[PDB]
A paper describes a structure:
OGFOD1 in Homo sapiens, Sud1 in Drosophila melanogaster, and Tpa1p in Saccharomyces cerevisiae were found to catalyze prolyl 3-hydroxylation of the highly conserved Pro62 and Pro64 of uS12 (RPS23) in humans and yeast, respectively (Ban et al., 2014; Katz et al., 2014; Loenarz et al., 2014; Singleton et al., 2014).
OGFOD1 crystallized in both trigonal (OGFOD1:Mn(II):NOG) and orthorhombic (OGFOD1:Mn(II):2,4-PDCA) crystal systems with either one or four molecules per asymmetric unit (ASU), respectively. Following optimization of hits from high-throughput crystallization trials, diffraction quality crystals for full-length H. sapiens OGFOD1 (542 amino acids [aa], 63 kDa) and S. cerevisiae Tpa1p (644 aa, 74 kDa) in complex with Mn(II) and inhibitors were obtained (catalytically inactive Mn(II) was used as an Fe(II) surrogate). In the Tpa1p:Mn(II):2,4-PDCA structure the 2,4-PDCA C-4 carboxylate is positioned to form a hydrogen bond to the side chain hydroxyl of Ser240, yet surprisingly is not positioned to form a salt bridge to the side chains of Arg238 or Tyr173 (corresponding to Arg230/Tyr169OGFOD1), respectively; in part this appears to be due to the unusual conformation of Arg238. The structure of OGFOD1 consists of nine α helices, six 310 helices, and 24 β strands that fold into two distinct DSBH domains. The “catalytic” metal binding N-terminal domain (NTD, 24–238) and the C-terminal domain (CTD, 270–542) are connected by a linker region (239–269) and pack tightly against each other via their “minor” β sheets (as defined below).
Residue numbers in the entry: 24 to 371, 430 to 542
Amino acid sequence: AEFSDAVTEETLKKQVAEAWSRRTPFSHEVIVMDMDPFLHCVIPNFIQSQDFLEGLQKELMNLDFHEKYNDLYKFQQSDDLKKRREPHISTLRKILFEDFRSWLSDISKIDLESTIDMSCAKYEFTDALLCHDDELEGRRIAFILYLVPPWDRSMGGTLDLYSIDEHFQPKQIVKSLIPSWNKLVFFEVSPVSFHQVSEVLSEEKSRLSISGWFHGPSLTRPPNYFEPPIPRSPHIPQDHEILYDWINPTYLDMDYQVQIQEEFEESSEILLKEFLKPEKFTKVCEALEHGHVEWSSRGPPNKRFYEKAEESKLPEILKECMKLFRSEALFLLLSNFTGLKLHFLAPSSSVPMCQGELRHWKTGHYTLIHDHSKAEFALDLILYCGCEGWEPEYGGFTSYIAKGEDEELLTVNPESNSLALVYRDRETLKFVKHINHRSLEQKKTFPNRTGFWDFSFIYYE
Ligand SMILES: O=C(O)c1ccnc(C(=O)O)c1
Ligand SMILES: [Mn+2]
């Protein structure tokens, strides 16, 4: 087999070359090329032999697939295609990396290498690949061939293209391409080529694709942009006594704190159930639902996506709960839980500090590791609210990982009125995993509720 004789036709080929050269859009029945938000082209009916595609799909489905998972994605990848000796796959490598490569090199005027870089992916219900730019030394042009069943927008799995802002960071989705059988999409890898594969919503269908890169000369990325640091502050001096009013009395007994600390110094992590008094916890949840909390979406999409409350406008109960977590008394309680010096009367410049946010998590939200995700000695605190009947399979758990390793260290799951404490070192990073569409099952038991909320606080010695 071969690829579309149409696009190899010399006049059309020269029209394509002209549009790439001049960076101008070009529309044709057999090819469509757009320059915004960045250069991307679509060739439908990429391989004319329908017999070949059937045999190819048959070979791929008969491969073994392996779960792939981290902050950025969740899907399945096949045995390496570079190592396969089945005829249809072997033929595809040649078509792509010899025939089609030269055609691309000709229209793009890039000395593309013959280096084979291709793989087969399978996205099913809740699989997704979040905002990223494909950046990796050598990659110049990304391509995707789709071998999907009949597909539409409501099934998800669309390839979305992000616009960009004044700081070269993704802003919003401005193009959304729907996969279809024998459709080839390719685009230029650049500092601005931010894109994602939206969550697959089809509970029955499987989004099968072949994707990879043509390699070429390395360029220079501009220096990466650094967010301003989040302000930190020391404890709020106790005026009125606050622990007694808020915390389960179990945790204010000395005998129980030594137990807690013995366990904490062993694991550097602990979970404290029923942490707030029930009456307070119920009033906090009630205020989060009915109290006119003002939420705002946080970005950018290659770092985070979630809602954060404007603390100054909160209901008094939620203000008071934020105060609890900044309070001198709590700083000392956390010292007795952990063995860390977060108050000057704890057992033995520097001044302990903290930062805090009240967050709302729903379907679609996440955080990602990014080049500037910075590691520090620090104690994390999370109190979850409004997540009754929440399952880890829904996403939304916090995960800790050793830097530059797939060795996962710990996972904290949303649990109503559970206080999680985690001490990190400078070689530890964290993320909140994409909340997927299984989380809609939450409404079967609590219909007047969308996702969950948490108080997230970080303390430093
Ligand atoms: O398989 C895809 O649709 C796809 C699209 C964009 N990027 C990737 C990737 O693996 O980076 C995969
Ligand atoms: Mn990609």
